[PDB]
Amino acid sequence: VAIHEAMEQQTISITKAGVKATLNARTSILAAANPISGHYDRSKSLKQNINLSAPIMSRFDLFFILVDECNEVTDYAIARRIVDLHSRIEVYSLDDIRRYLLFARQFKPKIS
Amino acid sequence: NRELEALKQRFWKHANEKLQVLKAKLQEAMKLRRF
Amino acid sequence: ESIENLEDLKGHSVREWVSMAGPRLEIHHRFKNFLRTHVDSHGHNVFKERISDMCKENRESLVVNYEDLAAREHVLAYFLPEAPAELLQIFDEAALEVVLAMYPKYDRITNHIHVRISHLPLVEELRSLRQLHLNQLIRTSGVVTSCTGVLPQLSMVKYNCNKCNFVLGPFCQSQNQEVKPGSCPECQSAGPFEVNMEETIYQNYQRIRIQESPGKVAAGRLPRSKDAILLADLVDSCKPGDEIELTGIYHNNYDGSLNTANGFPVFATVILANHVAKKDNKVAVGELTDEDVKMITSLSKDQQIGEKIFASIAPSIYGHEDIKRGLALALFGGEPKNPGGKHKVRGDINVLLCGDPGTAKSQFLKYIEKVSSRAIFTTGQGASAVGLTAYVQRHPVSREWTLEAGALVLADRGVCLIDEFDKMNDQDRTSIHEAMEQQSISISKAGIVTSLQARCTVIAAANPIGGRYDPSLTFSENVDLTEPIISRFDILCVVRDTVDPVQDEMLARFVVGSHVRHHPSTYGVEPLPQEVLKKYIIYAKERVHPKLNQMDQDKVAKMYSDLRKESMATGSIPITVRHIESMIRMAEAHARIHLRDYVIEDDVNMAIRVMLESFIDTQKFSVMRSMRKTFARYLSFRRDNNELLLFILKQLVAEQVTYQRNVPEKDLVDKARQINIHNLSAFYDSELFRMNKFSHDLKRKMI
Ligand SMILES: Nc1ncnc2c1ncn2[C@@H]1O[C@H](COP(=O)(O)OP(=O)(O)NP(=O)(O)O)[C@@H](O)[C@H]1O
Ligand SMILES: [Mg+2]
Ligand SMILES: [Zn+2]
């Protein structure tokens, strides 16, 4: 229930015994969800797949669907990526991306 | 380096302990009064 | 006599300098001149007006703005944060003998006047206070957590000698230690002494604890706090839970308890207060100026004032004109009354915003929180029954049970905003019944048996069952609330996000326009500025009290009766008297919006319209046509009455032309004030007299 206020109004308004507080939650949320019955049923809509209520679903700016296909080449590619990455450990580095992201977030684009 | 300076200019366009500041900017006005 | 000087150059320290007689007298004269010659941007002598408004109410306290003290007298602004106690004493004396020049008999009312400094620019975060700020004037903000009672503190104490009748002369009491005589000058007996309780002069004292506001920086960290001392008239300037803004001298003294606690020579600190504002009560009727009253009362003359006020609520929201109207009526509010001195009925108006997601209901509540003073905001599971009403606790130091204010008691003459109201628990939601109707909160707990005042307007927002409102069902059939809680809401509002591509285009263009307009960098009437609206609301809620003398009793009774008849067949609940009194309150609120001292037929028509449109909104979509026809034809959807005034004008012109052949605007309005058609302005802004070639002019008065 409190997620409703936090997602949109970016605040959490507690009013209980001994404390009244409108707390700040200026936060971007990256949610990960499990569909009902484990497998994502393509015949059913996404609303039918998950139990999230319509007010909650309206909060999210983007919904993405990851479905486990039975593809042989995809399985081989996943296994290869895991194994060769694990063996490798011994375009841009994460520090460069951090610096660019912090630099880029200072821009406030207008709307033409 | 002109384009890098232009990027700095764009960054500064979007860019948008104080008792001593107050005293200095006020002492300017008092200097004007004396003059 | 002591000669005038350039003040800013000296070899002494600032405190020593302003303590010396010459510069003290010069400072005194400068502040006197500043009070008697400062002017507004428009040229109004500010402090004559402020002193008159002080001496009328006997407030014995003069508020001065630093941001123009610095403009007028530079060196006074220079010395003030550096030597505040001394300069404020000098200011007090100068202000006193200015006030005794303006009102010579005011010494009968008070012998001393305090100068209170406001808008001090050297604001400080509460945890950022350091030794660098000691004995200097600071400004801080925080929530008041604790307050002592108002206590008498010694200020000028005379001691009776321990062995004889003599009174040892006045000692000026300090905030650091209890001043004492030592031994008597008439006979050198010594040690203990008796205070002369009658001749000793006392002053009001109140010690408060303030800490950082919970949402400011305390992101899971514990908040820092400071003690502050309020003296004389500053007592009762704040209560626990108040988001105050405090100006005061950061003062320190030796404390042996802290020394033994820390094992170091650590000195306790306290803020000697000099001004207390509140960051939610940004405007108050005690601070309104004559120019503010004048421009408010000029705005009320406009016939479009109702539309201007409605358009001025949440101007960044497109559409929802019915919502803005209902929120305006609740924001202004009706008139409380007690006929016979034995039967109370509330004046406040309650609103409920039901509807589907993405319709700015929570945004409306946030706007009301921002615009209205003494407002609070809470949400769903975040609220509790006990926190909403009131809570009983072991007192922190006494450890005896004490009652404490909840939400509806802290908003006792403001607005309590309850977002996502459908999602509360039932035990939490049912707690507000007494507060919503009887406007009291009665507690019988732990030996406390008392009733607190909760004269609060509750504005709530909710979703229907399943989130999405379905027009196939009535309001009662899909809201999930019960009749006792529904009927306590005077105004029911339904918002639906139904598709309509032209309206969607207009709404989307307005939303994009708001996003580009507010970059950091249905209205048709233009709003008021929000500062003007805050002044207008706070003026109208105190300086205006609409009376009721006649409202067309049979019309309202017939309306209510067949409203009950139609409601019996469908799904919203006009419980008997609450809807009648809702209409009375809304008529009083509309009169308050127009600054009317007495309720008129137009206000009653507006209240009837609001009630009926809300009731029609609660019907099934198929039933709205028949219901709307039923109420619209008979029950006073009084849109306009141009035809009577058209033929009155034509009759008067026919008689006048016949008289001429064998000031007509005065002739028109004479018959219009005789017949009950008094709102003639609609006739002049309507095309009926225009295509009959009539026209008007306020100067010539020919038509
Ligand atoms: N007519 C409108 N004009 C401008 N903004 C709007 C309008 N309708 C919705 N919005 C925006 O929609 C967003 C969500 O507002 P919000 O008040 O949370 O909706 P809501 O009615 O509370 N939905 P919900 O919380 O699920 O019941 C805000 O950014 C609003 O400004
Ligand atoms: Mg909401
Ligand atoms: Zn004696």
Cβ contacts of A106 on chain B, cutoff 8 Å: 11, 14-15
Q: Does residue C220 have its Cβ closer than 6 Å to ligand 1?
A: no
How many whole angstroms from its chain centre is CA A35?
A: 15
Which residues 188-247 in chain C show a CB within 8 A of chain B?
Answer: none
C547, β-bridge pairs:
C598
Cα separation of C94 and C26, whole Å?
11
C666, C649 in Cβ contact below 8 A?
no
Instruction: State which H helix or E strand residue C308 sits in.
Output: helix C305-312
Cα separation of C671 and C668, whole Å?
6
The CA–CA distances, whole Å, from C102 to C35, C98, C116, C289, C325 equal: 11, 6, 19, 19, 46
Cβ contacts of C136 on chain B, cutoff 8 Å: 19
Cα separation of C627 and C621, whole Å?
10
Residue C111: burial class (beta carbons within 10 Å; 0-12, 13-18, 19+): exposed
Residue C59: burial class (beta carbons within 10 Å; 0-12, 13-18, 19+): middle
C154, β-bridge pairs:
C202
Chain B interface mutation, best of C8, C82, C136, C138, highest count of B Cβ atoms under 10 Å? C8
B5, β-bridge pairs:
none
The CA–CA distances, whole Å, from C663 to A50, C96, C365, C649, C691 equal: 76, 58, 52, 13, 21
Q: Which of C6, C78, C520 sits opposite B23 (nearest CB)?
A: C78
Cα separation of C240 and C144, whole Å?
5
Which runs of E-coded beta strand occur in C197-337? 201-211, 225-231, 243-254, 267-278
C362 known member of a binding site? yes
Instruction: Supply the DSSP string of C265-294, one letter for each residue.
Output: -PEEEEEEEEEEEESS--S-GGG--HHHHH
Cα separation of C344 and C339, whole Å?
7
Which residues 38-97 in chain A show a CB within 8 A of chain C?
Answer: 53-55, 58
Q: Does residue C467 have its Cβ closer than 6 Å to ligand 1?
A: no
**Ligand with minimal distance to C162 CA:** 3
Cα separation of C361 and C421, whole Å?
11
Residue C563: burial class (beta carbons within 10 Å; 0-12, 13-18, 19+): buried
Contacts of C106 (CB under 8 A, 6+ apart): C55, C99, C100
Token couple for C378: 């809470």
Instruction: Supply the DSSP string of C405-450, one letter for each residue.
Output: E-HHHHTTTSEEEEESGGGS-HHHHGGGHHHHHT-EEEEEETTEEE
Cα separation of C481 and C463, whole Å?
11
The CA–CA distances, whole Å, from C332 to C51, C310, C385, C437, C590 equal: 30, 11, 27, 18, 8
C424, C414 in Cβ contact below 8 A?
no
* Amino acid residing at C7: E
Q: What is the CA radius of gyration of chain C?
A: 32
Cα separation of C573 and C614, whole Å?
11
Cβ contacts of B24 on chain C, cutoff 8 Å: none
C280, C329 in Cβ contact below 8 A?
no
Q: Which of B16, B22, B33 sits opposite C122 (nearest CB)?
A: B22
Among chain C residues, CA nearest to B14: C521
Strand C401-405 relative to strand C390-394, pairing: antiparallel
Cα separation of A43 and A15, whole Å?
44
Token couple for C10: 């000296």
What is the crossing angle of helices C305-312 and C576-593, to 10°? 100
Mutate to test the pocket of ligand 1, among C363, C463, C468, C506 (most ligand atoms within 8 A of CB): C363
Residue A62: burial class (beta carbons within 10 Å; 0-12, 13-18, 19+): exposed
Nearest-CA neighbor of C353 among C308, C417, C435? C417
Which residues lie at CB < 5 A from ion ligand 2?
C 361-362
Instruction: Supply the DSSP string of A30-86, one letter for each residue.
Output: ------TTSS--SSS-HHHHS---HHHHHH-S----------HHHHHHHHHHHHHHH
Q: What are phi and psi of C599, to 5 degrees?
A: -80, 140
* A108 at interface of B, judged by CB pairs closer than 8 A: yes
CB-based contact C357 A13, cutoff 8 Å: no
What is the crossing angle of helices C321-332 and C361-371, to 10°? 30
Cα separation of C652 and C287, whole Å?
51
C533, C315 in Cβ contact below 8 A?
no
CB-based contact A106 B15, cutoff 8 Å: yes
* A110 at interface of B, judged by CB pairs closer than 8 A: no
Resolution in A: 3.2
Instruction: State which H helix or E strand residue C390 sits in.
Output: strand C390-394
Name residue, tokens 């503190």: C153
Q: Binding site for ATP, residues of A?
A: 34
CA angle centred on C88, ends C207 and C46, rounded to 5°: 110
